[PDB]
Swiss-Prot record:
One of its GO terms (biological process) is proteolysis. It catalyses: Similar, but not identical, to that of thermolysin. Zn(2+) binds at residues 143, 147, 167. Ca(2+) 4 binds at residues 194-195, 198, 201. Its main location: secreted. Keywords: Calcium, Hydrolase, Metal-binding, Metalloprotease, Protease, Secreted, Signal, Zinc. Ca(2+) 1 binds at residues 58, 60, 62. It is an enzyme of class 3 (hydrolase). This is Bacillolysin. The chain holds residues 250 to 566 of 566 of the full protein.
Length: 317
């Protein structure tokens, strides 16, 4: 759509007020953001298994209706994920070429899943029990757009260790985006959307992978065909490593001194864009991460030391 930029207001999935960038055309306001280097579109699938759906249109530029919630967050958070990458690494969208960011909410009926399908974000509204509208989780969104980022960079195959690393990178950056927007920061994934009723729980833990039965050390890795080689469980290994590198701690004898989340992002972004390949394994991931930290902070630095410590702590060498 083509019109005038406007700033509307709405309430997200969690009932919080957010400022939205909309476009005014005719007597309607559309969920179209024209304020950033990449246009952000948000569609409505009207609870049908169709894509992308109709571009969200509103009459008064006030999205406070319950049906709006999913759209509000999807539109807002997508822009925030864009802000993080642009502000921090000066990356212009997923393909570093201004590719538009489209999102479709209200997909399917009680669909408990949200994902980047290769060209856009697709969100379900959950079944109310195990999930609420999945767009209410900034870490989940950062995770998914990062997948696009990886597709346009290292292109890690979603299989075995390459896949587990692919997932880890997404978790690391999803959390980093959560911190960027100060959206009640933590190292747990999907806490804001998982089980609307039960509080305190999450999809998985970066601080303590074993809290949900995930490997926090290479020795305890899943060695089977299921889940594309345990992609979603073995990611706990790298996630723990990432956590240790950022915050520091003692794990399996090894005592790591945290170098901060900012340096963490710098190291992984560089490693993923200038070193990691499609079949990168964990040990190779260690190699690339160390080299990246070497470039950014000097071969004989405290950072490079901490990188090595983190991997040794989780059993990768
Ligand atoms: Ca309205
Ligand atoms: Ca949080
Ligand atoms: Ca979180
Ligand atoms: Ca919960
Ligand atoms: Zn993922």
């Amino acid at each position: 759509v083509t019109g005038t930029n406007k700033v509307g207001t709405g309430k997200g999935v969690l009932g919080d007020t957010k400022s939205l960038n909309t476009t005014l055309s005719g007597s309607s306001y559309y969920l179209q953001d024209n304020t950033r280097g990449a246009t952000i579109f948000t569609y409505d699938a009207k609870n049908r298994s169709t894509l992308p759906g109709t571009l969200w249109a509103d009459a008064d530029n006030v999205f406070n209706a319950a049906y709006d919630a999913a759209a509000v967050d999807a539109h807002y958070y997508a822009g925030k994920t864009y802000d993080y990458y642009k502000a921090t690494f000066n990356r212009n969208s997923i393909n570093d070429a201004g590719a538009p960011l489209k999102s479709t909410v209200h997909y399917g009926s009680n669909y408990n899943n949200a994902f980047w399908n290769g060209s856009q974000m697709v969100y379900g509204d959950g079944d109310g029990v195990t999930f609420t509208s999945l767009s209410g989780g900034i870490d989940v969104i950062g995770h998914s757009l990062t997948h696009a980022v990886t597709e346009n960079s290292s292109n890690l195959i979603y299989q075995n260790e390459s896949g587990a690393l692919n997932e880890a990178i997404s978790d690391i950056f999803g959390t980093l985006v959560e911190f960027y927007d100060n959206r009640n920061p933590d190292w747990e994934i999907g806490e804001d959307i998982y089980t609307p009723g039960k509080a305190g729980d999450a999809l998985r833990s970066m601080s303590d992978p074993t809290k949900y039965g995930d490997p926090d050390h290479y020795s305890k890795r899943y060695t089977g065909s299921s889940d594309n080689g345990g992609v979603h469980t073995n990611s706990g290994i790298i996630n723990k490593q990432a956590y240790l590198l950022a915050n520091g701690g003692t794990h399996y004898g090894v005592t790591v001194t945290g170098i901060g989340k900012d340096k963490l992002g710098a190291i992984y972004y560089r490693a993923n864009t200038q070193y990691f390949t499609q079949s990168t394994t964990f040990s190779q991931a260690r190699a690339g991460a160390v080299q990246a930290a070497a470039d950014l902070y000097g071969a004989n630095s405290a950072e490079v030391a901490a990188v090595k410590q983190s991997f040794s702590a989780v059993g990768v060498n």
